[PDB]
Amino acid sequence: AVPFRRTSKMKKRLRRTHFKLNVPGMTECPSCGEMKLSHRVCKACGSYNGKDIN
Amino acid sequence: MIQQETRLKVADNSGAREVLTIKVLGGSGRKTANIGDVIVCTVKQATPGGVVKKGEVVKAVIVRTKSGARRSDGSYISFDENACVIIRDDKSPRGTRIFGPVARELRENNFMKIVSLAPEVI
C-alpha cells in the first residue's frame, strides 16, 4: 500500500485539529504556589495537605 | 460426541470387534451422537467366526461413551469405553448377549429388547 496521491495543504492541516495537546489541571498551593497541578505534590515546596514532605 | 470416523468397539456376541462410523443418521445433518443414537457403520475387525464379517456395512447403536450421558435429573452417566450394539433393520439386535454395563437411556428409546439382553442397565 503506497499513498496514491499527495495530501494537499488543507487536508494536512485538518488532521492537526485534534492533534493539539491540552492544559494541565492546575491550582495553587495553599502553602506557596504558584502553581501546582491537580492532586499531586508540587516541586515548589513539596507540601501536600499540608505536610512538608520534600 | 461420536462423530464421523470414530472407531467404536463392539459389545455383543455378533462376531465383531471394532466398528467404524460413517454417518450419524439424524437429519441433514449432525456431527455428534451421544448415547442411544443409530449410526450407519462398517466393521474393521472381528472375531473370526461371525455372521457379520469384516468389510460389511451394517448399522449399529451406541451404548456407552467416555462422553457423558446427561440424565435430566442432575446425575450424569459416563463410561470409560465406547460401544456399539448391531441392529438388523428393526430394533431387535442381531447380537445374542450384550456385554458390559449399559446406559439406561436406551429404554427411553425403542430398544426394549436391547435392555432385556444386557446385564447392568445403569
Binding site: - | 456407552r64 442432575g74 450424569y76 452417566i77 463410561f79 470409560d80 456385554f99 458390559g100 445403569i122
Partner: protein, 114 residues
C-alpha cells in the same frame, strides 16, 4: 453470595453424613422405569467434590464387568435416598482422576481402609 445462599437454605438436604473424596460409599438411588420406584443400590469409589453449597457434586465410580462407570450425583438432590459409607480411605490427594486409567490391583491398593 449470602443472598444467593439464604434462598436455598430451605432445600439444603440434611440427611446424609459427610465424606472425603477417597472412600467407598453405597448410594441408594430412586429410579423410575414405569411406574414404580426401584431403590437400586449403587457402589464404588467417591472421587469428585466440586463444591458450592447447593451446587455441590460427587462422583462414585464403579468398575463393573471389567468396565468403569463414572457417575456424578447431586449433593442435596431428592433422588438419592440414603447413603451408606462402607470404607474410609487414607488418600493423599483430593481429585482422584488418575484412576480412570489404573486397573485393577493398584486401584484396590490405593483403597486403604483408614
Amino acid at each position: 453470595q449470602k443472598l444467593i445462599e439464604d434462598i436455598t437454605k430451605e432445600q439444603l438436604r440434611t440427611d446424609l453424613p459427610a465424606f472425603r473424596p477417597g472412600d467407598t460409599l453405597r448410594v441408594h438411588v430412586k429410579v423410575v422405569e414405569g411406574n414404580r420406584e426401584r431403590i437400586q443400590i449403587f457402589e464404588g469409589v467417591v472421587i469428585k467434590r466440586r463444591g458450592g453449597g447447593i451446587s455441590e457434586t460427587f462422583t462414585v465410580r464403579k468398575i463393573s464387568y471389567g468396565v468403569g462407570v463414572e457417575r456424578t450425583f447431586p449433593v442435596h438432590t431428592p433422588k438419592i435416598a440414603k447413603i451408606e459409607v462402607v470404607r474410609y480411605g487414607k488418600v493423599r490427594r483430593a481429585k482422584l482422576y488418575y484412576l480412570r486409567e489404573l486397573r485393577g490391583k493398584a486401584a484396590r491398593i490405593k483403597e486403604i481402609r483408614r
